[PDB]
Amino acid sequence: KVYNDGYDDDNYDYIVKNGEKWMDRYEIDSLIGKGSFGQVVKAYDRVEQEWVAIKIIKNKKAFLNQAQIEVRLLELMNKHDTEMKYYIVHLKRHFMFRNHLCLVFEMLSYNLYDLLRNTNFRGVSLNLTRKFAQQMCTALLFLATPELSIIHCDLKPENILLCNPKRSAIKIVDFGSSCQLGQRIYQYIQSRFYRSPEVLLGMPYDLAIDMWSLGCILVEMHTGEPLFSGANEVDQMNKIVEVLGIPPAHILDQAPKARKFFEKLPDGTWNLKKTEYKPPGTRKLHNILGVETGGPGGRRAGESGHTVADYLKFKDLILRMLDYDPKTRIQPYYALQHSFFK
Ligand SMILES: CO[C@@H]1[C@H](N(C)C(=O)c2ccccc2)C[C@H]2O[C@]1(C)n1c3ccccc3c3c4c(c5c6ccccc6n2c5c31)C(=O)NC4
């Protein structure tokens, strides 16, 4: 039982070895990430004299073909001149090495989930959250470039990395599972916590599903907990409704999976199917954010930049991101014009 001459394990993953030299160029330091696609390695590039992250794709057609699509999107994105591209992780180059496709990315620092973990899931300031909010909106404006029209499709704290551990600059990484506007190919998409209503109801969707994700992420960044932490899709929708109420009838009348979560009563209105929740719309975002009670858990009482006014602008922006209708849900260009960023 030997795989690819001893270089691979039984999952077609490359057996990583610390200190290994590739092509008299890359000095492999250690394994820093792992996934179904394969592995991510820290390394030093002798030619450019810089630390890089090498994503080593499994030696398997399924995963190689997926990675070739990633490479297309990244190169497509990195070609565009506009400065909005410096919120996407840079793909420096790619190559084949002992039958594994290898993507060389710039090396970034911690991810926003690490950040939350350090606070013991109590969150970061509204002032830091604003900075992240603006940069993420700018990155979405970029993905909305008509010639790109890219749906990241899986936005979450662990996919948003800091450039430098002492600055607020962030970049979105991992477009491996990244949809693109067009004919619908997929329906089970996004990570559950950040999955939009249109996806849950099996409806048409577009770039607006990333905006939904962002709304959930920003609240999470300031409280430290996920806004909608569903253990399954029923739980997920039920938690969304707690805060936002029953979705509008005109959406549910069209929703193919409306009946997974709701029933249409004889009077024509929609209610939740019974399955431990607060009534629709009664777990108010106002109170989740602690608008008038000194922020979440009162921990921001007396910190500057956390007044009622400051919280009202943030709350308003968030609600416009969590619009049930993806046609009127706020768009990136308008997000950046909001009072919360002035
Ligand atoms: C996005 O981070 C992933 C890894 N997660 C976030 C996890 O394993 C986590 C899952 C759940 C909860 C917490 C972490 C961290 C690590 O490897 C992963 C696979 N990666 C990928 C995957 C796909 C494309 C690009 C990357 C990168 C990249 C980097 C990266 C990392 C840098 C430093 C430490 C860890 C680390 N990682 C990185 C990573 C990177 O610097 N550039 C691209």
Side-chain angles (χ1 to χ4, degrees), residues 2-342:
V2 177
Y3 305 88
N4 186 30
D5 292 1
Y7 295 107
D8 290 14
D9 67 15
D10 48 7
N11 285 312
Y12 322 97
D13 259 336
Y14 188 82
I15 296 162
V16 172
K17 283 159 190 177
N18 297 354
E20 194 173 65
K21 190 183 66 166
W22 298 358
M23 309 183 158
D24 198 54
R25 171 160 193 178
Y26 303 99
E27 299 170 323
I28 303 312
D29 200 76
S30 60
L31 185 70
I32 63 175
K34 193 191 169 78
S36 59
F37 66 80
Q39 299 180 112
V40 180
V41 142
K42 180 172 169 179
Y44 190 80
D45 176 359
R46 270 205 200 77
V47 168
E48 286 279 330
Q49 285 172 84
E50 58 174 14
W51 298 102
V52 295
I54 306 177
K55 186 184 189 181
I56 309 160
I57 303 302
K58 279 176 187 171
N59 186 6
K60 250 281 178 191
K61 288 163 186 177
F63 298 116
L64 162 64
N65 288 342
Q66 199 61 23
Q68 290 296 357
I69 293 164
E70 196 184 1
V71 168
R72 249 168 259 127
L73 295 189
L74 293 161
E75 286 175 344
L76 203 76
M77 284 186 294
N78 298 339
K79 291 281 154 51
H80 275 58
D81 294 21
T82 177
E83 296 192 320
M84 306 179 279
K85 78 195 180 189
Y86 296 121
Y87 295 114
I88 311 309
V89 71
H90 188 238
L91 170 67
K92 292 172 173 286
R93 72 195 68 79
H94 66 266
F95 58 88
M96 292 289 303
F97 177 75
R98 300 168 182 171
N99 300 308
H100 292 271
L101 179 59
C102 289
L103 281 51
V104 186
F105 291 101
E106 62 186 344
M107 178 89 194
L108 302 155
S109 201
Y110 305 91
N111 75 34
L112 294 202
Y113 180 94
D114 295 320
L115 224 62
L116 290 179
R117 194 199 277 116
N118 275 56
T119 67
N120 293 296
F121 310 103
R122 296 204 219 81
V124 302
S125 70
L126 202 59
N127 286 324
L128 181 50
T129 295
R130 181 185 297 98
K131 288 176 174 187
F132 294 161
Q134 177 172 292
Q135 296 177 74
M136 290 297 289
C137 286
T138 304
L140 289 194
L141 179 63
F142 182 66
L143 298 180
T145 302
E147 291 87 5
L148 294 184
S149 302
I150 295 168
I151 306 167
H152 181 271
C153 233
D154 191 27
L155 286 173
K156 40 178 178 190
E158 72 212 43
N159 282 337
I160 305 165
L161 273 55
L162 292 177
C163 293
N164 179 66
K166 308 170 204 179
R167 290 191 309 104
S168 60
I170 45 167
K171 295 252 179 71
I172 301 177
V173 299
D174 186 14
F175 290 75
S177 298
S178 275
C179 313
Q180 199 164 205
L181 190 63
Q183 301 192 139
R184 190 172 58 191
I185 308 297
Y186 315 113
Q187 300 194 49
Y188 192 68
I189 56 166
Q190 319 191 265
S191 289
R192 201 171 328 102
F193 292 173
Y194 313 90
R195 182 178 298 157
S196 65
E198 51 268 34
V199 168
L200 289 166
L201 300 159
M203 305 196 63
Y205 65 87
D206 52 16
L207 277 69
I209 74 178
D210 279 346
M211 187 57 79
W212 174 277
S213 297
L214 187 57
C216 302
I217 292 159
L218 293 172
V219 174
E220 176 163 8
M221 291 310 301
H222 183 50
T223 64
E225 292 167 358
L227 179 57
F228 304 132
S229 63
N232 50 43
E233 284 198 337
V234 171
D235 192 44
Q236 191 63 28
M237 182 60 73
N238 272 286
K239 293 198 177 140
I240 280 160
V241 161
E242 282 189 307
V243 178
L244 294 180
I246 302 282
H250 69 79
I251 296 191
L252 292 179
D253 292 337
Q254 299 175 265
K257 299 218 287 184
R259 274 148 179 122
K260 179 165 177 180
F261 324 98
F262 305 101
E263 64 184 46
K264 192 164 180 136
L265 296 163
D267 71 356
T269 68
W270 290 92
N271 283 27
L272 283 163
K273 306 219 299 181
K274 66 211 168 174
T275 67
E276 49 166 32
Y277 300 106
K278 291 197 77 191
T282 63
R283 192 205 164 196
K284 285 291 189 206
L285 190 62
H286 205 90
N287 301 321
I288 293 168
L289 295 182
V291 172
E292 304 180 28
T293 65
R299 293 180 300 272
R300 305 285 171 186
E303 189 176 339
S304 79
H306 298 76
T307 62
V308 171
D310 295 317
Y311 273 114
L312 282 170
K313 293 165 180 172
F314 182 53
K315 197 196 62 145
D316 185 83
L317 181 46
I318 295 305
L319 286 177
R320 295 277 304 110
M321 291 178 178
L322 299 181
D323 191 331
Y324 270 125
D325 187 359
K327 295 302 182 170
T328 60
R329 182 176 306 150
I330 193 150
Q331 294 160 61
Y333 175 97
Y334 296 97
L336 293 171
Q337 308 275 274
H338 206 268
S339 47
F340 180 62
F341 292 129
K342 310 190 176 198

